[PDB]
Amino acid sequence: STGSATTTPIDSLDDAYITPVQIGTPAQTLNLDFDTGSSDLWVFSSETTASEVDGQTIYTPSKSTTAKLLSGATWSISYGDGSSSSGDVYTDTVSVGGLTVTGQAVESAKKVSSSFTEDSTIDGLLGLAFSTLNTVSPTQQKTFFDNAKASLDSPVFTADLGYHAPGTYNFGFIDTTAYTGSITYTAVSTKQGFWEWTSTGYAVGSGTFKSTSIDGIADTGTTLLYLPATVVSAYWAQVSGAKSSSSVGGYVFPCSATLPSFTFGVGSARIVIPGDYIDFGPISTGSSSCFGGIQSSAGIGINIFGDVALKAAFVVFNGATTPTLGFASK
Numbered sequence: 001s002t003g004s005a006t007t008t009p010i011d012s013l014d015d016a017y018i019t020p021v022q023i024g025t026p027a028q029t030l031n032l033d034f035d036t037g038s039s040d041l042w043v044f045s046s047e048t049t050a051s052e053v054d055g056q057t058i059y060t061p062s063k064s065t066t067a068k069l070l071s072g073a074t075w076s077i078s079y080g081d082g083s084s085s086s087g088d089v090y091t092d093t094v095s096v097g098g099l100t101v102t103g104q105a106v107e108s109a110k111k112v113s114s115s116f117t118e119d120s121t122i123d124g125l126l127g128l129a130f131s132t133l134n135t136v137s138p139t140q141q142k143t144f145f146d147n148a149k150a151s152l153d154s155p156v157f158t159a160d161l162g163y164h165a166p167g168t169y170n171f172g173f174i175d176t177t178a179y180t181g182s183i184t185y186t187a188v189s190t191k192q193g194f195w196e197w198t199s200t201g202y203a204v205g206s207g208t209f210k211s212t213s214i215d216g217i218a219d220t221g222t223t224l225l226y227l228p229a230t231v232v233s234a235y236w237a238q239v240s241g242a243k244s245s246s247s248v249g250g251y252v253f254p255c256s257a258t259l260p261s262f263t264f265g266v267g268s269a270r271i272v273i274p275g276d277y278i279d280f281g282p283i284s285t286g287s288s289s290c291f292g293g294i295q296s297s298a299g300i301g302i303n304i305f306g307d308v309a310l311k312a313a314f315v316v317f318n319g320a321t322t323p324t325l326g327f328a329s330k
C-alpha cells in the first residue's frame with residue numbers, strides 16, 4: 001500500500017503545516033500537524049475542556065462506530081516550546097492520503113495549553129518520530145507510520161514541504177519526479193527516539209564550506225533551524241544590523257535587509273536554504289525589526305533541523321531495520 005497527502009502552511013510565514021487526516025467511521029476529518037519530532041497522535045475532541053477549544057475541529061469518539069476506549073490508558077506530553085496536552089485514549093481507524101491503519105491509538109485531549117487553544121488551525125498532532133517516545137501509559141502505543149509500515153510497498157515516508165506554498169507527505173514510496181539530482185542517505189541514531197543525524201558542515205552565502213560535524217534532529221514539527229551559537233553568529237554577522245535580542249528571544253534583523261543563503265552538508269552533498277526562507281517577518285505588527293529563521297540551540301540541548309531547513313529539500317525518512325535519512329535538492 002501507499003498514501004499521499006497534501007500539507008498546507010497554516011499562515012503566510014510557514015509557522016507550521018497541516019495535513020488532513022480521516023479518523024473514525026464515518027470519517028471525521030481533522031487537520032493535524034505531522035511532527036517527526038514526537039510520537040503521539042493526539043486530537044482536540046469532545047472531551048477537551050470547553051474553555052480550551054477556540055475554533056478547532058474536534059473528534060467525537062461516540063459518533064464513530066469503530067472507536068473503542070483503550071481502558072485505563074492516559075497520555076501527557078510536554079514539548080520543547082513549553083506547550084503541553086493530556087487526556088485518555090481510543091483506538092480507531094485512521095487514514096492519511098488513502099493509506100488506512102486500523103486500531104490506531106488516537107489520543108483524545110482533555111487538556112491543552114494556551115498556545116494550542118490559540119491556534120485555531122491545528123486540530124492536533126500526528127507524531128512520526130520513533131515509538132519509544134510515545135507517552136501513553138501504562139501500555140506504550142505505536143505511531144501511525146509504525147503501524148502502517150509492514151503494509152507499505154517500502155518502509156519509508158517522505159516530506160516535501162513548500163516555501164509559502166503547499167507540499168506533500170508520501171507513505172510507502174519515493175516519488176522520483178519530486179527532486180533533482182540524487183538522494184544522499186546518512187546514518188541515523190535512534191538512541192533519543194528522534195531522527196537524529198550528523199551534518200557534515202555549513203556555508204554562509206557564497207562563503208567557503210566549513211567542514212564540521214553537527215549532530216541534530218530532522219523535525220517537521222519545529223518551525224526554525226536551531227544550530228550551535230558559533231554557526232549562528234557566523235550567519236548573522238553577514239547581515240548588517242542583525243543582533244541577538246534577549247527581550248525578543250533571538251536574532252532579529254532589519255526588515256530592509258536581503259538575507260544570504262545558508263548551506264548545510266549531508267555527507268558530500270549540499271542543501272542550500274535560500275535567504276528568503278530565513279525571513280520570519282516583523283517581530284510585532286508594523287515593526288521594522290524582523291525575526292530570524294536561524295537561531296541558537298544553546299539553550300535547548302539539541303540542534304534542530306526544522307522546517308526552515310527541511311523545506312529546502314526532499315527528505316526521505318527510511319524506516320528499514322536500520323533507519324536512515326535521505327536528502328535531495330528540489
Ligand SMILES: CCNC(=O)C1CNC1
Nearest residue numbers: 035037038079080221222
Ligand atoms: C516528545 C518531545 N518532542 C518535541 O518536543 C519535538 C519538537 N517537535 C516535537
Ligand SMILES: CCNC(=O)C1CNC1
Nearest residue numbers: 006160161162166167168
Ligand atoms: C501540491 C503539492 N506540492 C508540493 O509537493 C511542492 C513541491 N515542493 C512542495
